[PDB]
Design a protein around this ligand. Structure first.
Ligand SMILES: [Zn+2]
Length: 157
């Protein structure tokens, strides 16, 4: 799993960075994690308005609804699956090649459950306010989270 970060500088630039990235890296399906249900719902709404097909999973969903959502994703009906930090470990991201942390994990431990299973590329969005916490992450683990390259056309090969 290759781990990168994009310094979006401020929360407001995250949405545009996500959609531009989505096009630039030419990926089809991706999983996105946010730290709160509210952010998941808001990002899902914006994405859908922009014509993207998205599925969202929340804790308040009964097992039936979650299993439906997953089938929606696995079949390709939805190109994007968005979930919360709390549900990351319970989400069986298949061999999805791209995972995006729209919000940098606030719980350092949960980070390894938010980077996929090898598809494997994980991209972390950080603002000037989160950059520090990211460094702590690199220490908490013995890994290296590199700044995303200027040219990612061949990112996921
Ligand atoms: Zn764990």
């Amino acid at each position: 799993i290759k781990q990168f970060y994009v310094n979006v500088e401020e929360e407001e630039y995250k949405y545009e960075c996500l959609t531009d990235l989505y096009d630039s890296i030419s990926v089809t399906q991706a999983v996105i994690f946010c730290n709160t249900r509210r952010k998941v719902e808001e990002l899902t709404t914006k994405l859908r308005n922009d014509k993207f097909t998205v599925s969202a999973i929340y804790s308040d969903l009964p097992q039936q609804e979650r299993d439906t959502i997953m089938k929606e994703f696995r079949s390709g009906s939805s190109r994007i699956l968005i979930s919360t930090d709390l549900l990351a470990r319970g989400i069986d991201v298949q061999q999805v090649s791209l995972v995006i942390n729209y919000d940098l994990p606030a719980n350092k431990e949960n980070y390894i459950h938010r980077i996929g299973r090898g598809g494997g590329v994980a991209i972390n969005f950080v603002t000037n306010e989160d950059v520090g916490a990211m460094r702590e992450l690199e220490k908490f683990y013995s890994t290296q989270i590199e700044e995303l390259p200027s040219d990612i056309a061949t990112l996921l090969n």
